[PDB]
Amino acid sequence: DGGQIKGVGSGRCLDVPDASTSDGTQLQLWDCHSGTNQQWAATDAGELRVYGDKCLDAAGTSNGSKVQIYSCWGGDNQKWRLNSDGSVVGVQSGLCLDAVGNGTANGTLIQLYTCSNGSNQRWTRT
Ligand SMILES: O[C@@H]1[C@@H](O)[C@H](O[C@@H]2CO[C@@H](O[C@@H]3CO[C@@H](O[C@@H]4CO[C@@H](O[C@@H]5CO[C@@H](O)[C@H](O)[C@H]5O)[C@H](O)[C@H]4O)[C@H](O)[C@H]3O)[C@H](O)[C@H]2O)OC[C@H]1O
Numbered sequence: 864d865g866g867q868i869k870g871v872g873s874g875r876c877l878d879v880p881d882a883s884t885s886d887g888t889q890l891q892l893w894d895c896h897s898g899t900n901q902q903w904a905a906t907d908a909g910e911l912r913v914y915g916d917k918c919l920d921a922a923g924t925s926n927g928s929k930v931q932i933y934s935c936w937g938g939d940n941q942k943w944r945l946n947s948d949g950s951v952v953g954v955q956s957g958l959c960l961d962a963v964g965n966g967t968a969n970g971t972l973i974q975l976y977t978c979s980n981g982s983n984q985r986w987t988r989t
Pocket of ligand 1: 886921922
């Protein structure tokens with residue numbers, strides 16, 4: 864089924880750059896559209912999957928750690944808890960999906976950051 868993951872503060876969607884499938888590609892915000900690189904499926908294993916086999920993936924547990932796509936493998940850094948307030952928390956890190964520098968424009972990067980009430984850490988949809 865899928866579903867976009869749209870940033871509240873930016874009104875832009877969680878987007879895989881160029882619809883790349885390459886391990887390590889950092890996530891960005893982009894104007895929402897119908898493509899597969901903006902479709903995210905939540906799984907029972909706690910994942911946010913794109914293209915079927917790729918996972919939203921935290922490269923570390925520290926502030927400013929890159930959020931990237933990576934081949935799904937079962938790691939806890941590929942597990943996320945989408946809260947009731949729209950925060951997306953990394954299970955391994957206890958840090959939140961965060962649009963870097965409170966950025967809102969196309970191309971602003973996504974990272975892990977200390978959970979706050981910033982609108983750059985709030986996301987809607989499935
Ligand atoms: O030297 C340092 C750099 O390494 C660092 O770069 C970042 C390192 O982290 C990168 O992201 C993580 C990469 O590792 C992933 O976990 C892997 C997934 O693959 C598993 O192996 C598979 C096992 O099954 C086999 O059949 C198959 O062949 C294998 O693929 C492996 O066991 C796991 O460890 C994590 O999910 C990622 O988070 C990140 O992209 C880099 O930027 O930067 C600092 C530098 O000093």
